[PDB]
Symmetry: C2
Subunit: 347 residues, 2 copies
């Protein structure tokens, strides 16, 4: 109630896209998307770039790290549109919706529902017929693939950073343990808690589990956490990891976790992944992180070989998956060089 505000996540505007029928059967009476727009559209509206948010992240995280005038995502050249996930606290979520969708009563939202909402937003409010580039990380990458598969003609270029088209079984288990880290807390009360802080024990265990998988063994072996200003592992868990998840809402995290678990573009073909990825007509750069523990390089390489006219351009960083937070300046330089080449490539 105090963390998901405009004082720490602004600027963004709320847009009502209307009723949204979800894949799981339930129908949201009204769906609100928190949107952050940087840069202006040109005459024919051909310089639009779509940027989805990742797990537990907002539009503020993306703009502070990747969006800038000296960056590949240049607002002086492109109209970068950052859409917050449904269930991340800023958009329509369990923490801000009333009625029978309040708290644990919030419906099961899938990746396809996010893209469906974003497609309505771009057409009914912006009047955009095509996207120059769709770029996202982790869960944002899952939405990137869904976009490129569901609306192949709509997407000119695609950039998936540290994310897969179909969520693996090993990654599924990881998220399941992440969920149980919270639901094992008696203070959770099946989502009927009166304070996200009350569920501190679940959130702290949630943070420690991310410490184990979010980075890499080489990250802590070389003392990278010490170079960030933390004298030890114990202090890194508290001062960085626990600090991050503490003011967040358990229900929202479970909402995004459920969606993360079932990220799969092959549902549009009935499980056939190769047939689904073959539908992609956009110029796609598959960019996994070298030391990612659950979104491994071999996973993404396996999927890239199914995408026509794509390129496998992995990022080198020992910071692992959570290198997306901009802890590695060198990794960002690699990303800028890749995206610039992508945006320079014809469509």
């Amino acid at each position: 109630n105090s963390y998901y505000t405009e004082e720490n996540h602004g600027p963004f505007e709320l847009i009502n896209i209307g009723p949204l029928p979800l894949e799981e059967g339930r129908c949201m009476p009204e769906c609100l998307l928190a949107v952050a727009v940087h840069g202006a559209l040109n005459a024919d509206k051909s310089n639009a770039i779509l940027v989805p948010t990742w797990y537990s992240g907002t539009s503020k995280a993306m703009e502070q790290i990747y969006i800038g005038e000296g960056r590949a995502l240049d607002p002086s050249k492109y109209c970068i549109i950052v859409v917050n996930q449904i269930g991340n606290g800023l958009s329509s979520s369990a923490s801000n919706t009333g009625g029978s969708l309040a708290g644990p009563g919030f419906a099961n939202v899938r990746i396809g529902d996010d893209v469906s909402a974003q497609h309505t937003l771009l057409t009914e409010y912006f009047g955009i017929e095509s996207l120059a580039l769709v770029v996202g990380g982790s869960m944002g990458a899952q939405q990137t693939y869904e976009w490129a598969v569901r609306y192949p003609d709509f997407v000119k270029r695609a950039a998936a950073i540290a994310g897969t088209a179909r969520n693996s079984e090993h990654d599924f288990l990881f998220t399941e343990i992440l969920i149980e880290a919270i639901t094992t807390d008696p203070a959770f009360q099946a989502g009927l808690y009166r304070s996200s802080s009350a569920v501190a024990a679940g959130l702290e265990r949630h943070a420690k589990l991310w410490t184990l998988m979010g980075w890499s063994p080489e990250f802590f072996r070389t003392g990278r956490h010490k170079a960030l200003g933390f004298e030890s592992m114990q202090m890194f868990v508290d001062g960085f990891m626990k600090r991050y998840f503490a003011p967040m809402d358990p229900n929202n995290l479970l909402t995004m976790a459920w969606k993360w678990q079932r990220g799969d573009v092959s549902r549009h073909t009935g499980g056939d992944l190769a047939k689904a990825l073959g539908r992609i007509k956009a110029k796609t750069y598959v960019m996994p992180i070298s030391h990612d523990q659950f979104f491994t390089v071999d996973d993404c390489l396996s999927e890239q070989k199914m995408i026509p006219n794509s390129e496998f351009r992995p990022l080198r960083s020992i910071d692992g998956h959570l290198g997306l937070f901009g802890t590695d300046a060198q990794m960002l330089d690699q990303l800028d060089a890749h995206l610039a080449e992508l945006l320079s490539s014809p469509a």
Copy 2:
């Protein structure tokens, strides 16, 4: 009901007497579960010591590594498998009475195991030197402790998938493994009357091992399918959960606490190089290529401090839990290495 001779036999119980522990407390009587394979020769120079690993017993070692066609040959060597203190077979929280019963069981360290094993080998078997000390994971931690504590006693050493000093990343991993059990209300701070009552805690423990015990490439290539499981879900239940289900939470916590604090540099005051420099044995540091917490770079860092050692890593995508003998090729690599080690002069 699980820690019996029907599935861990055959082994003998030996009373080595009182054992003063490093944590201050003193066990009135310590019983070691010992499995002996092969006979000693005339001068008793063919003795091999094999420690057990986490949640494992002496039965696991003999079923996988000990055999006539193997490097650990009972027809040539007297392989002595000693069960860890607190693994259910030896003196544990589940079989000791008095003030050491259940959660009242003392904090046992790696040095306490080796101290007990040294007392056993000299005062009861009359063995003056070991031809080889070989172990995996926690067994490797005891191997390093042996090579440092008693440098003249150990002729050869083989540490598979284990480090001399436990890292922070490995420490955290074990800490989460413990909390997987202690988050269960049925645990009752170790005052449960049935290990089965804590099934929910044990199941989360098993799933967490599935995430870290193997590797992402293990499940990607369908290696779990070749083991007889059509899916991940069917592998977690039929293999992993099946394994930890009949085990005792307190025993697992005892060995976890010991695992967390595996460090030979306590004998030198934190100086690891000075501790590893004490080793006079021929040492093979053999980490597994896809180990997630006992990484290759961790062991490589420590191998460069050990005099007259060799860095001979094992390649297997099965990860750390390849020690269960799931990878036939990894066993071939290990046998070739151990055979060359035992063939090397002393």
